[PDB]
Design an enzyme around this catalytic site. Structure first.
Site, PDB file in Angstrom:
ATOM      1  N   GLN A 179      -5.955 -56.819 102.532  1.00  0.00           N
ATOM      2  CA  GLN A 179      -4.967 -58.017 102.040  1.00  0.00           C
ATOM      3  C   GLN A 179      -5.520 -59.307 102.682  1.00  0.00           C
ATOM      4  O   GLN A 179      -5.792 -59.364 103.772  1.00  0.00           O
ATOM      5  CB  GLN A 179      -3.680 -57.628 102.772  1.00  0.00           C
ATOM      6  CG  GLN A 179      -2.560 -58.693 102.271  1.00  0.00           C
ATOM      7  CD  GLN A 179      -1.160 -58.334 102.565  1.00  0.00           C
ATOM      8  OE1 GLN A 179      -0.804 -58.552 103.791  1.00  0.00           O
ATOM      9  NE2 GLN A 179      -0.614 -57.654 101.485  1.00  0.00           N
ATOM     10  N   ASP A 238       0.839 -54.661  93.685  1.00  0.00           N
ATOM     11  CA  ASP A 238       1.290 -55.709  94.656  1.00  0.00           C
ATOM     12  C   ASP A 238       2.528 -56.239  94.440  1.00  0.00           C
ATOM     13  O   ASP A 238       2.867 -57.163  95.160  1.00  0.00           O
ATOM     14  CB  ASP A 238       0.200 -56.638  95.119  1.00  0.00           C
ATOM     15  CG  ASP A 238       0.151 -57.008  96.778  1.00  0.00           C
ATOM     16  OD1 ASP A 238      -0.551 -57.802  97.027  1.00  0.00           O
ATOM     17  OD2 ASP A 238       0.631 -56.198  97.603  1.00  0.00           O
ATOM     18  N   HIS A 261       1.416 -65.792  82.772  1.00  0.00           N
ATOM     19  CA  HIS A 261       1.974 -67.270  84.027  1.00  0.00           C
ATOM     20  C   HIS A 261       3.304 -66.144  84.968  1.00  0.00           C
ATOM     21  O   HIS A 261       3.103 -66.395  86.317  1.00  0.00           O
ATOM     22  CB  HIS A 261       2.674 -68.044  83.166  1.00  0.00           C
ATOM     23  CG  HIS A 261       3.188 -69.289  83.834  1.00  0.00           C
ATOM     24  ND1 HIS A 261       4.633 -69.373  84.164  1.00  0.00           N
ATOM     25  CD2 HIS A 261       2.392 -70.310  84.285  1.00  0.00           C
ATOM     26  CE1 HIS A 261       4.747 -70.553  84.820  1.00  0.00           C
ATOM     27  NE2 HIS A 261       3.642 -71.126  84.731  1.00  0.00           N
ATOM     28  N   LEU A 310       3.933 -58.104  97.930  1.00  0.00           N
ATOM     29  CA  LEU A 310       4.174 -57.163  99.051  1.00  0.00           C
ATOM     30  C   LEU A 310       3.112 -57.152 100.068  1.00  0.00           C
ATOM     31  O   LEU A 310       1.986 -57.568 100.057  1.00  0.00           O
ATOM     32  CB  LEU A 310       4.165 -55.681  98.476  1.00  0.00           C
ATOM     33  CG  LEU A 310       5.152 -55.305  97.269  1.00  0.00           C
ATOM     34  CD1 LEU A 310       4.827 -53.842  96.638  1.00  0.00           C
ATOM     35  CD2 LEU A 310       6.480 -55.392  97.652  1.00  0.00           C
ATOM     36  N   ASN A 343       1.237 -55.371 102.546  1.00  0.00           N
ATOM     37  CA  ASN A 343       0.680 -53.935 102.717  1.00  0.00           C
ATOM     38  C   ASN A 343      -0.851 -54.089 102.838  1.00  0.00           C
ATOM     39  O   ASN A 343      -1.299 -55.144 103.638  1.00  0.00           O
ATOM     40  CB  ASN A 343       0.773 -53.019 101.170  1.00  0.00           C
ATOM     41  CG  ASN A 343       0.243 -53.850 100.116  1.00  0.00           C
ATOM     42  OD1 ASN A 343      -0.152 -54.884 100.145  1.00  0.00           O
ATOM     43  ND2 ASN A 343       1.406 -53.749  98.944  1.00  0.00           N
ATOM     44  N   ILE A 389      -3.462 -54.292 100.336  1.00  0.00           N
ATOM     45  CA  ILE A 389      -3.992 -54.724  99.207  1.00  0.00           C
ATOM     46  C   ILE A 389      -3.636 -56.170  98.864  1.00  0.00           C
ATOM     47  O   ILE A 389      -2.494 -56.773  99.285  1.00  0.00           O
ATOM     48  CB  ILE A 389      -3.970 -53.881  98.013  1.00  0.00           C
ATOM     49  CG1 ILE A 389      -2.659 -53.912  97.407  1.00  0.00           C
ATOM     50  CG2 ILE A 389      -4.286 -52.286  98.316  1.00  0.00           C
ATOM     51  CD1 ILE A 389      -1.672 -52.802  97.382  1.00  0.00           C
ATOM     52  N   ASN A 403       3.394 -81.541  84.932  1.00  0.00           N
ATOM     53  CA  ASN A 403       2.004 -82.063  84.981  1.00  0.00           C
ATOM     54  C   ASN A 403       1.517 -83.424  84.488  1.00  0.00           C
ATOM     55  O   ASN A 403       0.381 -83.322  83.931  1.00  0.00           O
ATOM     56  CB  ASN A 403       1.102 -80.744  84.840  1.00  0.00           C
ATOM     57  CG  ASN A 403       1.425 -79.629  85.441  1.00  0.00           C
ATOM     58  OD1 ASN A 403       2.031 -79.555  86.445  1.00  0.00           O
ATOM     59  ND2 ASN A 403       1.070 -78.398  85.181  1.00  0.00           N
ATOM     60  N   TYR A 458      17.050 -83.030  86.674  1.00  0.00           N
ATOM     61  CA  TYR A 458      18.624 -83.106  87.037  1.00  0.00           C
ATOM     62  C   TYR A 458      18.698 -83.061  88.512  1.00  0.00           C
ATOM     63  O   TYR A 458      17.997 -82.557  89.287  1.00  0.00           O
ATOM     64  CB  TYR A 458      19.210 -82.037  86.328  1.00  0.00           C
ATOM     65  CG  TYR A 458      19.099 -81.794  84.842  1.00  0.00           C
ATOM     66  CD1 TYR A 458      19.727 -82.981  84.047  1.00  0.00           C
ATOM     67  CD2 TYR A 458      18.823 -80.760  84.164  1.00  0.00           C
ATOM     68  CE1 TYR A 458      19.643 -82.951  82.728  1.00  0.00           C
ATOM     69  CE2 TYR A 458      18.596 -80.858  82.736  1.00  0.00           C
ATOM     70  CZ  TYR A 458      19.216 -82.049  82.201  1.00  0.00           C
ATOM     71  OH  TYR A 458      19.220 -81.938  80.675  1.00  0.00           O
ATOM     72  N   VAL A 517      18.641 -79.974  90.490  1.00  0.00           N
ATOM     73  CA  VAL A 517      17.841 -78.932  90.614  1.00  0.00           C
ATOM     74  C   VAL A 517      16.555 -79.657  91.531  1.00  0.00           C
ATOM     75  O   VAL A 517      16.457 -81.206  91.829  1.00  0.00           O
ATOM     76  CB  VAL A 517      16.966 -79.047  89.328  1.00  0.00           C
ATOM     77  CG1 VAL A 517      15.634 -77.922  89.265  1.00  0.00           C
ATOM     78  CG2 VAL A 517      17.878 -78.676  88.087  1.00  0.00           C
TER      79      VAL A 517
END
Ligand SMILES: [Ca+2]
Ligand code: NA
Lengths: 63, 276
Positions: free
Chosen positions: B2, B41, B64, B75, B77, B79, B155, B171, B174
């Site tokens: 990992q 994963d 995406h 996760l 772990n 890997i 972007n 907004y 947000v």
């Protein structure tokens, strides 16, 4: 060179020529105006937002 | 083995993992192109598709959504990578098709599903150049109902003194997120304007990709899930805090960078935000 203001209400083909005749490996995609899109930034991509008349409605832009 | 992607350490998520705070039981809706739930994963807890011809939200034909979801919650772990909030409950709310586009009503329906199912955080790595009354209504109701709502700034780079932040990031309800690199420098593509709230890593971010792959991507799409994940960490340590409190703790503890027009309040620091 990162945007083509100069491509206005030009047709599909005029935008494809100018852009390719300026950025050879462009991955060009035509999409309707008034859609939402991902915000990844890909140097290869130029998204083209058209009206129902197949004319460019918004400044085309790399990414 | 990992690997910890650099963005996860830049925001200081590991200091929280070291006290046992990892997002457990916090519900995060990734409103996007779906998530590949069979990724080794990732663990996906539920979901729904709003896209009429792609009815499986657990299949991501774009790539995406899965990459965004790994930034939030890959996760812990032995890997692949590690998410900002690796015990979070991830929900796939598919609103975009295989070509990465969707209609405004599909986005709105996604936000509505997120409210109805009691999500704690919404991430929106998506946008358009124009708003609408229905879109404004739907994000303002999520916030009224208690949800922390985060979105990519856009972007579009700079255009003089004009703002280039797209919707729904524009907004006030947000948190609009721009992109820095590993040196805390604004990325060239990152949108600017008074509506820009905070910055997070957005350049060469490694995350999960469909079919047991990993891959680096750029964009304010990659910066946003850092902040959605940070919110989930804060809620796992302070489950009693409101969306108001979470947002203000992030905005008040940033590492200040340049001019607010280009950098908002600066780079988030979740270790500092969680000590408030
Ligand atoms: Ca992992
Ligand atoms: Na905003």
């Amino acid at each position: 060179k990162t945007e083509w203001p100069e491509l206005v209400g030009k047709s599909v083909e005029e935008a494809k020529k100018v852009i390719l005749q300026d950025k050879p490996a462009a991955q060009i995609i035509v999409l309707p105006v008034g859609t939402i899109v991902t915000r990844s930034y890909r140097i290869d991509r130029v998204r083209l937002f058209v009206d129902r008349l197949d004319n460019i409605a918004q400044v085309p832009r790399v990414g | 083995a990992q690997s910890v992607p650099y963005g996860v350490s830049q925001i200081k998520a590991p200091a929280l993992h070291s006290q046992g705070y990892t997002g457990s039981n916090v519900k995060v809706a990734v409103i996007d192109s779906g998530i590949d739930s069979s990724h080794p994963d990732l663990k996906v807890a539920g979901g729904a598709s709003m896209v009429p011809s792609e009815t499986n939200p657990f299949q991501d034909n774009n790539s995406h959504g899965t990459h965004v979801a790994g930034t939030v919650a890959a996760l812990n772990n032995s890997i692949g990578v590690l998410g900002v909030a690796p015990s979070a409950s991830l929900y796939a709310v598919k609103v975009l098709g295989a070509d990465g586009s969707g209609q405004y009503s599909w986005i709105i329906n996604g936000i509505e599903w997120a409210i109805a199912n009691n999500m704690d955080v919404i991430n929106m790595s998506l946008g358009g150049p124009s708003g609408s009354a229905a879109l404004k209504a739907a994000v303002d109701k999520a916030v009224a109902s208690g949800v922390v709502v985060v979105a990519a700034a856009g972007n579009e780079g700079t255009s003089g003194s004009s703002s280039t932040v797209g919707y729904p990031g524009k907004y006030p309800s947000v948190i609009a997120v721009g992109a820095v690199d590993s040196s805390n420098q604004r990325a060239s593509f990152s949108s600017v304007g008074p509506e820009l709230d905070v910055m997070a890593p957005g350049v060469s971010i490694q995350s999960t990709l469909p079919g047991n792959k990993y891959g680096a991507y750029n964009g304010t799409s990659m910066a946003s899930p850092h902040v959605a994940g940070a919110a989930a960490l804060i809620l796992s340590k302070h489950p009693n805090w409101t969306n108001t409190q979470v947002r203000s703790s992030l905005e008040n503890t940033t590492t200040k960078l340049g001019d607010s027009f280009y950098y908002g309040k600066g780079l988030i620091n979740v270790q500092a935000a969680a000590q408030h």
